[PDB]
């Protein structure tokens, strides 16, 4: 890989610079280089990795949705035929998106998850595995769509099982996992009741544990609790 000659610490330093410059493709490439050094990642490093790819794929998903909407409009009654270009360009963006998801899933499988023994690391990586399978599911229309959905579900479920056993209900990783799994249920699995139940139970169990927290932890937890409430408001 192109980052093979760069020191691990230099890659991490440059990832932080790239973040400040809002250069998320660079940030992701630096973090990929850092993962490929083969050492485990610290908490801060895990977050850099996630921030970088979340931003890259987030932009691709937004572009894909714009193009998909145009494509859907082209296939309505009365719409003038404009040739293959809309499908082609949507496919181009889709393929690039799938490539990024496959890259992230590859890092997780080789070998981040298998070396992650602490709950905070293992849950975080399994949540990411769920997330990137969910992004694949968003664009899937073929033979493998059910398997892709199941891969997302399985990863999220393993993460949920560990989080419930090993983390307090206010832990931000536990909360963010539940938030995202709830969205999986609503948007991917056609399970809005499960989505709503999960978000409500997560919120309520967190509420009950806030009393144990410092001011700074309270701020962290309540921010994600508000995201749960926002989704509940959207869905009810």
């Amino acid at each position: 890989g192109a980052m093979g000659s760069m020191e691990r610490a230099s890659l991490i330093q440059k990832a932080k610079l790239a973040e400040q410059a809002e250069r998320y493709e660079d940030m992701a490439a630096f973090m990929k280089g850092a993962v490929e050094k083969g050492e485990e990642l610290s908490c801060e490093e895990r977050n850099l990795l996630s921030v970088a790819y979340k931003n890259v794929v987030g932009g691709q998903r937004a572009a894909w949705r714009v193009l998909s909407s145009i494509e859907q409009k082209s296939n309505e009654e009365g719409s003038e035929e404009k040739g293959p270009e809309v499908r082609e360009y949507r496919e181009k963006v889709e393929t690039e998106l799938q490539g990024v998801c496959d890259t992230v899933l590859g890092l997780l499988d080789s070998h981040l998850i298998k070396e992650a023994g602490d709950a905070e690391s293992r849950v975080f990586y399994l949540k990411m595995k769920g997330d990137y399978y969910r992004y694949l599911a968003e664009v899937a229309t073929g033979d493998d769509k059910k398997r892709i959905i199941d891969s997302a579900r399985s990863a999220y479920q393993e993460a949920m099982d560990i989080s419930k056993k090993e983390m307090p209900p206010t832990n931000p990783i536990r909360l963010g996992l539940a938030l995202n799994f709830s969205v999986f249920h609503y948007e991917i699995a056609n399970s809005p009741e499960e989505a709503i139940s999960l978000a409500k139970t997560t919120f309520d169990e967190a509420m009950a544990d806030l009393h144990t927290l410092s001011e700074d932890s309270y701020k962290d937890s309540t921010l994600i609790m508000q995201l749960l409430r926002d989704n509940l408001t959207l869905w009810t």
Binding site: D131, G176, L179, N180, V183, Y186, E187, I224, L227, D230, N231, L234, W235
Partner: peptide, 5 residues
Amino acid sequence: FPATV
């Protein structure tokens, strides 16, 4: 779209 982190 709904919130995710």
